Amino acid sequence: FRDGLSYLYVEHAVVEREAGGIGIYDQEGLTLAPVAGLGVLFLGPGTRITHAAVRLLAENGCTVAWVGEGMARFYAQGLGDTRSAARFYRQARAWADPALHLEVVMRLYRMRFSEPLPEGLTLEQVRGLEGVRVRNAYARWSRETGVPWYGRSYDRGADPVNRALSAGASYLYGLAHAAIVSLGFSPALGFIHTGKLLSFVYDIADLYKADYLVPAAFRTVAESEEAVERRVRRALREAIQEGRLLERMAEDLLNLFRGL
Amino acid sequence: LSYLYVEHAVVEREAGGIGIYDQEGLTLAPVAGLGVLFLGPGTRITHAAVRLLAENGCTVAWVGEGMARFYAQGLGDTRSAARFYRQARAWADPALHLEVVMRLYRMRFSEPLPEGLTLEQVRGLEGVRVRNAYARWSRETGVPWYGRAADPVNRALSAGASYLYGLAHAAIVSLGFSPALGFIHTGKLLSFVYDIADLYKADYLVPAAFRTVAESEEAVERRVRRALREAIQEGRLLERMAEDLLNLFRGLGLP
C-alpha cells in the first residue's frame, strides 16, 4: 500500500481482465485488483496470464515480472506512464558521451555508500572501496545474525541459505525495472552494467540492496532455515512499507542525470 | 529473422519447446533459436512456457490482430543490447546521425539520389516522391486525389497507417532497437517507429488504400487493414522490415 508504486505477488492462479482492473482467479476464489498505481505484477510459478490482462497492465503504465525459483527473470513493459519522455534523451546523452558516462558511473557508485566519500576518487579506487564495503556488510549481518560468514556466491543451480538473497533480488529487480520504465527511462542504457537490455535495472537495484536485500534475507533466515523465498518476500514488503524505498527510488532516478 | 505469431491459443511448456494448444489441433515449436513469439489477441501464456522462453534468449511481443498494434514486449536477461547500443551511438554523434538520415532517405528512393544535396533538398525530393506516388495511384486506381471533409481514401490512409505503426513498433522492439531514438523524426517516443514506417508507406499503404477505395467506398478502414495484413504476409513486409533495420546501422563501427 505504497503511493503510486508496486504490490502484488501472484502464484498458482489465472490473471484475466475484469471491469475495474485485473481479476486473479485463485484457489481462494476471485480477487480483483485495480491496475492503476500497481507498479509491478509479480507472477510466481503456476501462473497463467491472458492477453487481455497483459494489454490492460501495459496500457495502464504497469510492468509484469516473472519471478520464481531463479531460472529466468523475465519481464514485460509497455511504454511507461512518462509518455512525455525527454529524460530518456538525457539518459541517452549521458550514456553516449564518455565524460558524462563516467560522471554517472561515479554518481551510481558514490550513492551506494551510507557515509559520504572524500574529495574525488578514480574509478579503480571507488570500485575497490565499494567491494570492500560490500564484503563488510555481507559479513556484518552474518555477525549480527547467526547465519555463517560465507554467503557470497550465486548461480548456476542448490545452495545454502543464500538463495533467499537471490530470491529477494528477483523482487528488488522487478521493482527497479518498474521504476525505470515508469519514469520513462530505458532499462537498456546501462552505465555500470553493460551488454543487456536490462543493465540499468541492475544499476538502479544495487543502490538499495545493501539496506533491504541483505538484512531481510539474513534476518528472515535466522529463525527460518525452511521457508526462505516467501518469507524473504514478506519481510521485504514489510520493510518497503515501514521504510520508504519506492519514493526514494524515484527521486534518485530523476536526479541521476539532472545536473550533468 | 525467426519469429512465430500465435493467436487464439494456449501457450504452455511441452517437454521440448513451446506447445501452442489450438482449438483445432496442436502445434509445437522449438524454443532453441527462436527470435520473437508474437502473442495475438486470443493467447494465454503459462509461467512454465515463459521460463523456457527466457532461458533460451527469447522475447515475447504482445501484439494486436495480425500485428496491427503493439502493447508490450517480454524481456529475458540474456537479451543483448548491442543493436540498441549501435543505434544509440549513431543517434548521439552528429556525423553518424546524418549518415543514418541519408540511408533512411535513400532506402525509399527508387531513383538514384545525387549524393550531394543539403538536407532541405533531400527533403524536397521526399515531398516530390510522396506526392508523385499519391497521384500515380490516383491514376492507376482511378480515384480522385484532392490535395474539408474526409474522403474514403484519406480515412483509409490513416486506417492503414495505424497498422503500419503497429508493425513498425513490434519489429523495432523485437529486434532489440529503441522505438524512441528517431533520426528523421525527433522529439517523442515512437519517433524511430515513424522513421521506419515511412520507408514502407509508399510501397504498401498507398497502393492498398487506393485499390480498396476503388473496389468499394463504404467499409474502407477494415478492408484496407485486411489488405495490408495480406500484403504483410503474402509479401515479406516483416522480413523486408527486418533486414532494413539490421543493415541501417553499419556506419563507423565501434564493436
User: What are the CA-CA distances from residue B74 to residues A79, A198, B37, B186, B241 (Å)?
Assistant: 12, 11, 9, 26, 20
CB atoms within 10 A of CB B143: 17
Q: Which of A55, A82, A197 to mutate to test the interface with B (most CBs of B within 10 A)?
A: A197
Residue position matching grid coordinates 503511493: A3
Q: Does the annotation place A177 within a ligand binding site?
A: no
Q: Does the annotation place B198 within a ligand binding site?
A: yes
* Residue from the list B54, B55, B80 with its beta carbon closest to the beta carbon of A195: B80
* Contact in structure between B18 and B50 (CB atoms under 8 Å): no
* Residue from the list B43, B47, B72 with its beta carbon closest to the beta carbon of A43: B47
Question: With an 8 Å Cβ cutoff, are A45 and B47 in contact?
Answer: yes
* Residue from the list A52, A72, A85 with its beta carbon closest to the beta carbon of B55: A72
Phi/psi at B221 (5° precision): -55, -60
Provide the number of CB pairs (under 8 Å) joining chain A to chain B.
128
Q: Which residues of B touch A (CB under 8 A)?
A: 39-48, 50-51, 53-55, 60, 62, 71-82, 84, 88-89, 91-93, 176, 178, 180-181, 188-189
Shortest CA gap B99–chain A (Å): 17
Please tell me which residue of chain A has the smallest CA distance to B57.
Answer: A72
Question: With an 8 Å Cβ cutoff, are A51 and B73 in contact?
Answer: no
Sign of CA dihedral B218, B223, B227, B232: positive
B82-255 topology per CATH: Four Helix Bundle (Hemerythrin (Met), subunit A) (1.20.120)
Alpha carbon distance B224, B154 (integer Å):
11
Report the relative pairing of strands A9-10 and A40-43 from DSSP bridges.
Answer: parallel
Mind spelling out the 3-state secondary structure of B180-223? CCCCCCCCCCCHHHHHHHHHHHHHHHHHHHHHHHHCCCCCHHHH
Contacts of B47 in chain A (CB under 8 A): 43-48, 66, 68
Alpha carbon distance B99, B250 (integer Å):
10
Residue B62: name the closest of A197, A49, A123, A204 by CA. A49
Question: With an 8 Å Cβ cutoff, are A96 and B89 in contact?
Answer: yes
The CATH architecture that domain A86-260 belongs to is Up-down Bundle (1.20)
Alpha carbon distance B255, B123 (integer Å):
32
Contacts of A100 in chain B (CB under 8 A): none
* Amino acid at residue number B129: R
Mind spelling out the 3-state secondary structure of chain B? CCEEEECCEEEEEECCEEEEEECCCEEEECCCCCCEEEECCCCEEEHHHHHHHHHCCCEEEEECCCCCCEEEEEECCCCECHHHHHHHHHHHCHHHHHHHHHHHHHHHCCCCCCCCCCHHHHHHHHHHHHHHHHHHHHHHCCCCCCCCCCCHHHHHHHHHHHHHHHHHHHHHHHCCCCCCCCCCCCCCCCHHHHHHHHHHHHHHHHHHHHHHHHCCCCCHHHHHHHHHHHHHHHCCHHHHHHHHHHHCCCCCCCC
Please give the sequence-ordered ranges of beta strands (E in DSSP) within chain A, or none if there are none: 9-10, 14-18, 21-26, 29-33, 40-43, 48-50, 63-66, 74-77
DSSP string, A185-230: --TT--SSS-SBTTHHHHHHHHHHHHHHHHHHHHHTTTS-SS-HHH
- Segments making up each domain of chain A, as ranges: 1-85, 86-260
| C-alpha triplet B76, A4, B54: angle, nearest 5° | 10
Please tell me which residue of chain B has the smallest CA distance to A78.
Answer: B72
User: What are the CA-CA distances from residue B145 to residues A144, B133, B142, B206 (Å)?
Assistant: 79, 11, 9, 12
Q: Does the annotation place A193 within a ligand binding site?
A: yes
Q: Which of B51, B192, B193 to mutate to test the interface with A (most CBs of A within 10 A)?
A: B51
